[PDB]
Amino acid sequence: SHHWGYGKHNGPEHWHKDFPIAKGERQSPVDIDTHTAKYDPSLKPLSVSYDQATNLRILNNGHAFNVEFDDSKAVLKGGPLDGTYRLIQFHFHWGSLDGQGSEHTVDKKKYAAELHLVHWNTKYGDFGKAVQQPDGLAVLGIFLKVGSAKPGLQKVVDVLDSIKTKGKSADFTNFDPRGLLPESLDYWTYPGSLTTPPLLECVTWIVLKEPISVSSEQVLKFRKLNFNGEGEPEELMVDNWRPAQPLKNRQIKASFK
Ligand SMILES: CC(=O)Nc1nnc(S(N)(=O)=O)s1
Ligand SMILES: [Zn+2]
Ligand SMILES: [Zn+2]
């Protein structure tokens, strides 16, 4: 298949052929330069209102694994946002044993991995309408570094063996994303895009300053996933990140001095 991916023949340098907005003015990720990302006082503290979700789904879509929220609850408000944004899913980007694998960088420094909690603006009635609008999505990005285990990640890691290959999905119940947050909600924000096709410029990025620590054993489980489908040759799911994109006219703002 010539479906997009992260390989030599289908990776980020190819994406613009099917998705011309890849070369747009508000593409993500970007490098966050601490000397030019200015403190903005128009910015409020973030309001992250999460709790245990009952019915979820975990799946390997050949690009990452998603944990999807199916309850008909978890919302993000405040910070740079107007209105209420509902959590729909989260997923990660990561590197190999030999490399870093965040999407955003800070002063050109990459973190081991990056968590994306994807939220859509409830004003729009559904996700498909939301992605068509500049205020449609809010993605809360959280860096991962390797250290001690993140207890609230363990339930996710424990079920990754069951979705090893592309197309596998599984029922997943009783998960609280509060367990994925760092202590501080200090953040940077800027207007940007989905970091994967369709690369739509519909995202308010909120990137937390404080990384979470995960164990090498936890991230190892990420790296044992496969890009390929069952029965095909093994291609380990690693380095599923897009390179940093030009800031162009944008300003990155900081919630903190
Ligand atoms: C359905 C959905 O959430 N699609 C996404 N595609 N890219 C995303 S990202 N990396 O910008 O968080 S989210
Ligand atoms: Zn796809
Ligand atoms: Zn992502």
In a domain, residue 48? The reply is yes
Phi, psi of 20 (to 5 degrees): -55, -25
Number of separate domains in the chain:
1
Say if ligand 1 is within 6 A of residue 116 CB. Answer: yes
In a domain, residue 13? The reply is no
- Closest C-alpha to ligand 1, atom 3: 118
Residues with Cβ within 8 Å of 11's Cβ and at least 6 positions away in sequence, in order, are 4, 5
Mutation pick for ligand 1 pocket among 118, 120, 203 (CB with most ligand atoms within 8 Å): 118
**Number of the ligand closest to the Cα of 198:** 1
In a domain, residue 181? The reply is yes
Say if ligand 1 is within 6 A of residue 194 CB. Answer: yes
In a domain, residue 9? The reply is no
Phi, psi of 131 (to 5 degrees): -65, -10
How far apart, in Å, are the Cα atoms of 245 and each of 12, 30, 115, 148, 166? 11, 5, 18, 31, 28
11 within 8 A of 188, measured Cβ to Cβ: no
Distance 255 CA to ligand 2 centre (A): 34
Residues with Cβ within 8 Å of 25's Cβ and at least 6 positions away in sequence, in order, are 201, 248, 249, 250
Distance 250 CA to ligand 2 centre (A): 28
Q: Is 204 annotated as a binding residue?
A: no
CATH classification of the domain holding 117: 3.10.200.10
In a domain, residue 158? The reply is yes
Distance 35 CA to ligand 3 centre (A): 25
228 within 8 A of 166, measured Cβ to Cβ: yes
Residue 164 belongs to what domain range?
A: 25-254
Method of determination is X-ray
Burial class (CB in 10 A: 0-12, 13-18, 19+), 216: exposed
Entry resolution in angstroms? 1.8
How many beta carbons lie within 10 A of that of residue 52, not counting itself? 14
In a domain, residue 6? The reply is no
Say if ligand 1 is within 6 A of residue 64 CB. Answer: no
- Closest C-alpha to ligand 1, atom 12: 116
In a domain, residue 221? The reply is yes
Say if ligand 1 is within 6 A of residue 139 CB. Answer: yes
Residues with Cβ within 8 Å of 128's Cβ and at least 6 positions away in sequence, in order, are none
Pairing, β 137-146 against β 203-208: parallel
Entry field: residues in the chain: 257
Say if ligand 1 is within 6 A of residue 206 CB. Answer: no
For ion ligand 3, residues whose CB falls within 5 Å: 116
In a domain, residue 12? The reply is no
Q: Is 104 annotated as a binding residue?
A: no
| Rounded Cα–Cα distance for residues 110 and 210 (Å) | 14
Q: Is 93 annotated as a binding residue?
A: yes
